[PDB]
Coordinates of C-alpha atoms and ligand atoms in Angstrom, one line a residue:
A778 CA -2.0 -1.8 37.5
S779 CA -0.7 -3.0 34.1
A780 CA 0.6 -0.4 31.6
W781 CA -0.4 -2.5 28.6
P782 CA -2.6 0.2 27.1
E783 CA 0.6 2.2 26.7
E784 CA 2.3 -0.4 24.5
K785 CA 0.8 1.1 21.4
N786 CA 2.9 4.3 22.0
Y787 CA 6.2 2.4 21.7
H788 CA 5.2 -0.2 19.2
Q789 CA 7.6 -0.3 16.2
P790 CA 7.1 -2.1 12.9
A791 CA 9.2 -5.1 11.8
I792 CA 10.2 -3.8 8.3
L793 CA 10.0 -6.1 5.2
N794 CA 13.1 -6.4 3.1
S795 CA 13.1 -6.3 -0.8
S796 CA 12.5 -10.0 -1.3
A797 CA 9.5 -9.9 1.0
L798 CA 8.1 -6.7 -0.6
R799 CA 8.1 -8.4 -4.0
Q800 CA 6.3 -11.4 -2.5
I801 CA 3.6 -9.2 -1.1
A802 CA 3.3 -7.3 -4.4
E803 CA 2.9 -10.5 -6.3
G804 CA 0.5 -12.0 -3.8
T805 CA -2.4 -9.7 -4.2
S806 CA -4.6 -9.8 -7.3
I807 CA -6.6 -6.7 -8.4
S808 CA -8.6 -8.7 -11.0
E809 CA -9.6 -11.4 -8.4
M810 CA -10.6 -8.6 -5.9
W811 CA -12.6 -6.9 -8.7
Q812 CA -14.6 -9.9 -9.6
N813 CA -15.0 -11.7 -6.3
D814 CA -15.1 -9.0 -3.7
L815 CA -16.0 -5.7 -5.4
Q816 CA -18.6 -6.3 -8.0
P817 CA -21.0 -8.1 -5.6
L818 CA -21.0 -4.9 -3.5
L819 CA -21.8 -2.5 -6.3
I820 CA -25.4 -2.5 -5.5
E821 CA -27.9 -0.2 -3.7
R822 CA -27.3 -1.0 0.0
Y823 CA -28.7 1.8 2.2
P824 CA -29.6 0.7 5.8
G825 CA -32.4 -1.8 6.1
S826 CA -32.6 -2.4 2.3
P827 CA -32.4 -5.8 0.6
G828 CA -29.0 -4.9 -0.7
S829 CA -27.7 -4.1 2.8
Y830 CA -28.6 -7.7 3.7
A831 CA -26.9 -9.0 0.6
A832 CA -23.8 -6.9 1.2
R833 CA -23.5 -8.2 4.7
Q834 CA -23.9 -11.8 3.7
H835 CA -21.3 -11.3 1.0
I836 CA -18.8 -9.8 3.4
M837 CA -19.3 -12.6 6.0
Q838 CA -19.1 -15.4 3.3
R839 CA -15.9 -14.0 1.9
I840 CA -14.3 -13.9 5.4
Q841 CA -15.7 -17.3 6.4
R842 CA -14.1 -19.1 3.4
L843 CA -10.6 -18.1 4.6
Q844 CA -8.2 -20.3 6.7
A845 CA -7.4 -17.8 9.4
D846 CA -9.5 -18.1 12.5
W847 CA -11.8 -15.0 12.0
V848 CA -14.6 -14.6 14.6
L849 CA -17.5 -12.7 13.0
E850 CA -20.0 -10.7 15.1
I851 CA -23.0 -8.7 13.9
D852 CA -23.7 -5.6 16.1
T853 CA -27.3 -4.9 15.5
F854 CA -29.1 -1.9 17.1
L855 CA -31.8 0.7 16.8
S856 CA -31.5 4.4 16.3
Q857 CA -33.9 7.3 15.7
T858 CA -33.5 8.7 12.1
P859 CA -35.3 11.3 10.0
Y860 CA -37.6 8.4 8.9
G861 CA -38.3 7.1 12.3
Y862 CA -36.7 4.2 14.3
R863 CA -34.6 1.9 12.2
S864 CA -32.3 -1.1 12.6
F865 CA -28.6 -1.1 11.7
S866 CA -25.9 -3.8 11.7
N867 CA -22.2 -3.2 12.0
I868 CA -20.0 -6.2 10.9
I869 CA -17.0 -6.9 13.1
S870 CA -14.4 -9.6 12.1
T871 CA -11.7 -10.3 14.7
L872 CA -8.6 -12.6 14.9
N873 CA -7.8 -13.5 18.5
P874 CA -10.8 -11.8 20.3
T875 CA -9.1 -12.1 23.7
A876 CA -5.8 -10.7 22.6
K877 CA -5.4 -7.4 24.4
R878 CA -4.4 -5.2 21.5
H879 CA -5.7 -5.1 17.9
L880 CA -4.7 -3.1 14.8
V881 CA -8.1 -2.2 13.3
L882 CA -8.9 -1.5 9.7
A883 CA -12.4 -0.1 8.9
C884 CA -14.8 1.3 6.3
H885 CA -18.5 1.7 6.0
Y886 CA -20.5 -0.8 3.9
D887 CA -23.8 1.1 3.6
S888 CA -24.5 3.3 0.5
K889 CA -26.2 6.6 0.7
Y890 CA -29.9 6.5 0.1
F891 CA -31.2 8.2 -3.1
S892 CA -34.5 7.5 -4.8
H893 CA -33.7 6.2 -8.4
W894 CA -33.2 9.1 -10.8
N895 CA -33.7 8.6 -14.5
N896 CA -33.1 4.9 -14.0
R897 CA -29.8 5.4 -12.3
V898 CA -29.1 3.9 -8.9
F899 CA -26.4 5.2 -6.4
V900 CA -23.9 2.5 -5.6
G901 CA -21.1 4.5 -3.9
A902 CA -18.2 2.7 -5.6
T903 CA -15.4 4.8 -3.9
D904 CA -17.8 5.5 -1.0
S905 CA -17.0 2.9 0.2
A906 CA -17.4 -0.3 -1.8
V907 CA -13.7 -0.2 -2.9
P908 CA -12.5 0.3 0.7
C909 CA -14.7 -2.8 1.7
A910 CA -13.3 -4.8 -1.2
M911 CA -9.7 -3.8 -0.2
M912 CA -10.2 -5.1 3.3
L913 CA -11.6 -8.4 2.0
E914 CA -8.7 -8.7 -0.5
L915 CA -6.2 -8.0 2.2
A916 CA -7.7 -10.7 4.4
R917 CA -7.5 -13.1 1.4
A918 CA -4.0 -12.2 0.3
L919 CA -2.5 -12.4 3.7
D920 CA -4.5 -15.4 4.9
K921 CA -1.5 -17.7 5.2
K922 CA 0.4 -15.2 7.2
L923 CA -2.7 -14.4 9.4
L924 CA -3.3 -18.1 10.0
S925 CA 0.0 -18.0 12.0
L926 CA -1.6 -15.7 14.7
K927 CA -3.9 -18.6 15.7
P928 CA 3.1 -8.4 21.7
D929 CA -0.4 -9.8 22.5
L930 CA -1.5 -8.0 19.3
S931 CA -3.7 -9.1 16.4
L932 CA -6.1 -7.8 13.7
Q933 CA -9.7 -6.7 13.5
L934 CA -11.8 -5.5 10.6
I935 CA -14.9 -3.4 11.1
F936 CA -17.5 -2.7 8.4
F937 CA -19.8 0.1 9.7
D938 CA -23.4 0.4 8.8
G939 CA -25.2 3.7 8.5
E940 CA -22.3 6.1 7.9
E941 CA -24.3 8.2 5.5
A942 CA -27.0 10.7 6.4
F943 CA -30.5 9.7 5.3
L944 CA -30.9 13.4 4.2
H945 CA -27.9 15.8 4.2
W946 CA -25.3 15.5 7.0
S947 CA -26.4 16.6 10.5
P948 CA -25.0 15.6 13.9
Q949 CA -27.9 13.3 14.6
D950 CA -28.4 12.0 11.0
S951 CA -25.0 10.4 10.1
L952 CA -22.4 8.0 11.6
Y953 CA -25.1 5.7 13.1
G954 CA -22.9 2.6 13.2
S955 CA -19.7 4.2 14.4
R956 CA -21.4 6.3 17.1
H957 CA -23.1 3.2 18.4
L958 CA -20.0 0.9 18.2
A959 CA -17.6 3.4 19.7
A960 CA -19.9 3.8 22.7
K961 CA -20.3 0.1 23.0
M962 CA -16.6 -0.7 22.8
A963 CA -15.9 2.1 25.3
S964 CA -18.2 0.4 27.8
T965 CA -17.0 -3.1 27.3
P966 CA -14.3 -4.4 29.6
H967 CA -11.3 -5.8 27.7
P968 CA -9.7 -8.3 27.8
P969 CA -12.6 -10.4 29.3
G970 CA -12.6 -10.0 33.1
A971 CA -10.7 -6.7 33.2
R972 CA -11.4 -4.3 36.0
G973 CA -10.6 -1.0 34.3
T974 CA -9.7 -1.2 30.7
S975 CA -12.1 -1.3 27.7
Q976 CA -12.1 -2.5 24.1
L977 CA -11.2 1.1 23.1
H978 CA -8.0 1.0 25.2
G979 CA -7.2 -2.2 23.2
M980 CA -7.5 -0.4 19.8
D981 CA -3.9 0.3 18.9
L982 CA -4.8 2.3 15.8
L983 CA -7.9 2.7 13.7
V984 CA -7.0 2.8 10.0
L985 CA -10.2 4.1 8.3
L986 CA -10.3 3.6 4.5
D987 CA -12.7 6.1 2.9
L988 CA -13.5 7.4 -0.6
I989 CA -10.7 5.4 -2.2
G990 CA -10.8 4.3 -5.9
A991 CA -10.6 7.6 -7.9
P992 CA -7.5 8.8 -9.9
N993 CA -4.7 10.8 -8.2
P994 CA -5.7 10.6 -4.5
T995 CA -3.7 12.7 -2.1
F996 CA -4.0 11.6 1.6
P997 CA -3.1 14.3 4.1
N998 CA -1.4 13.5 7.5
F999 CA -4.3 14.6 9.7
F1000 CA -3.2 13.8 13.3
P1001 CA 0.0 14.2 15.3
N1002 CA -0.6 11.1 17.3
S1003 CA -0.6 8.8 14.2
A1004 CA 1.9 10.9 12.2
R1005 CA 4.7 8.3 12.6
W1006 CA 2.4 5.7 11.0
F1007 CA 1.5 8.0 8.2
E1008 CA 5.3 8.3 7.7
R1009 CA 5.6 4.5 7.5
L1010 CA 2.9 4.6 4.7
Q1011 CA 5.0 7.2 2.9
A1012 CA 8.2 5.0 3.3
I1013 CA 6.4 1.9 2.1
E1014 CA 5.0 3.7 -1.0
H1015 CA 8.4 5.1 -1.8
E1016 CA 10.2 1.7 -1.5
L1017 CA 7.6 -0.2 -3.5
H1018 CA 7.9 2.5 -6.1
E1019 CA 11.7 2.3 -6.2
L1020 CA 11.5 -1.5 -6.5
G1021 CA 9.3 -1.1 -9.5
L1022 CA 6.4 -2.8 -7.8
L1023 CA 3.7 -0.1 -8.4
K1024 CA 1.9 0.6 -11.7
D1025 CA 1.4 4.0 -13.5
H1026 CA 2.9 5.7 -10.4
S1027 CA 5.3 8.6 -9.9
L1028 CA 6.8 10.2 -6.8
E1029 CA 5.7 13.6 -7.9
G1030 CA 2.2 12.1 -8.0
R1031 CA 2.6 10.1 -4.8
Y1032 CA -0.4 9.4 -2.7
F1033 CA 1.0 10.1 0.8
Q1034 CA 2.3 13.6 0.7
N1035 CA 4.0 15.7 3.3
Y1036 CA 1.0 17.9 4.3
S1037 CA -1.5 18.3 7.0
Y1038 CA -5.1 19.3 7.1
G1039 CA -6.3 21.2 10.2
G1040 CA -10.0 21.0 9.6
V1041 CA -12.4 18.3 10.7
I1042 CA -13.9 15.8 8.2
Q1043 CA -17.1 14.1 9.4
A1044 CA -16.6 10.4 9.1
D1045 CA -16.7 7.1 11.0
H1046 CA -13.4 7.8 12.8
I1047 CA -14.9 10.7 14.7
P1048 CA -16.7 8.8 17.6
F1049 CA -13.4 6.9 18.2
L1050 CA -11.1 10.0 17.9
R1051 CA -13.3 11.8 20.5
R1052 CA -12.9 8.9 22.9
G1053 CA -9.1 9.0 22.5
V1054 CA -8.4 6.3 19.9
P1055 CA -5.4 7.1 17.6
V1056 CA -6.6 7.3 14.0
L1057 CA -5.0 7.1 10.6
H1058 CA -7.8 8.5 8.2
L1059 CA -7.0 7.3 4.7
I1060 CA -9.4 9.7 2.9
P1061 CA -8.2 11.8 0.0
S1062 CA -8.4 15.6 0.0
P1063 CA -10.0 16.8 -2.3
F1064 CA -12.7 14.1 -2.4
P1065 CA -13.3 12.2 -5.8
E1066 CA -15.0 14.5 -8.3
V1067 CA -17.9 11.9 -8.4
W1068 CA -18.6 12.2 -4.7
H1069 CA -22.3 11.7 -3.9
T1070 CA -23.4 11.6 -7.5
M1071 CA -24.6 8.7 -9.6
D1072 CA -21.3 8.8 -11.3
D1073 CA -19.6 7.2 -8.3
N1074 CA -19.6 4.0 -10.2
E1075 CA -17.4 1.2 -11.5
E1076 CA -16.5 2.9 -14.7
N1077 CA -14.9 5.8 -12.9
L1078 CA -12.6 3.7 -10.6
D1079 CA -8.8 3.7 -11.3
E1080 CA -7.7 0.0 -11.2
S1081 CA -4.0 0.5 -11.0
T1082 CA -4.3 3.1 -8.1
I1083 CA -6.5 0.6 -6.1
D1084 CA -3.9 -2.1 -6.9
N1085 CA -1.0 0.1 -5.6
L1086 CA -2.9 1.0 -2.5
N1087 CA -3.7 -2.7 -1.8
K1088 CA 0.1 -3.4 -1.9
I1089 CA 0.9 -0.5 0.4
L1090 CA -1.8 -1.4 2.9
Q1091 CA -0.9 -5.1 3.0
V1092 CA 2.8 -4.3 3.6
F1093 CA 1.8 -1.8 6.4
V1094 CA -0.4 -4.4 8.1
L1095 CA 2.3 -7.1 8.0
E1096 CA 4.9 -4.8 9.3
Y1097 CA 2.7 -3.5 12.1
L1098 CA 1.9 -7.1 13.2
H1099 CA 5.5 -8.4 12.8
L1100 CA 4.3 -11.0 10.2
Ligands
ZN1055 ZN1 -20.7 9.3 1.3

């Protein structure tokens, strides 16, 4: 009986030296992400809407144009909602589908439904169009390195549909896409042909980007079983800072601070956390002041903070994958 699902417990990063850190900092472009990955997503895209369809096509097209061998899958399902039965579609993008282990980055691509108010439309810029754009920019910036994957370990991106409640949060009205996908992965043998391990055993770590894009985010270290990876984010941020590779950034105002949060935050990681998947929840506490208001828009995003986080995230992923 193979002990491969335990490998994630001992997995260590392959740390980048200074010359490599400068290369990564220079290889990501916040302006290109802004124009080509983010702006197209800053539209009304609640589940089942025309914008949901447009967001999904945009995400798939941006992944499809890359050199790395991404395999795209649309996980479409029905769920009861306060408005009756509806259809939802999670987007899953995977490098090396049969590899046993994957580091997984995730966000939700739906936007919360609101009827238009005084000609304003809710586009959830931090929630979570920016996280979506960061995943696409990471795939683009690291494309050459990811092409080399073509430790039986690779990368997977998941864009959840239906994270938001159609009304206000309730156990049954929220997390539609993640509750569905977690159950599906838990009941899917992995790798193909396995007798007793599932796709969830294959998830090394679920890194969920959430509510990112506002000024001065502070991310708490939520879980003891991913604490050592939170510490790696702290170390990466500190070194990129010391090398002068971050913009408008100080250690007093660092993003990854030494501090826990004992409460529960309802989000897409929950259905995975409750089935035993290690999670690194990159959500700030407190939430952006514009949370769930029409002001969660492009104008209120902090460009240099998103740029700094792109650099930190890309370095984390390369180090985790030994690339
Ligand atoms: Zn929200």
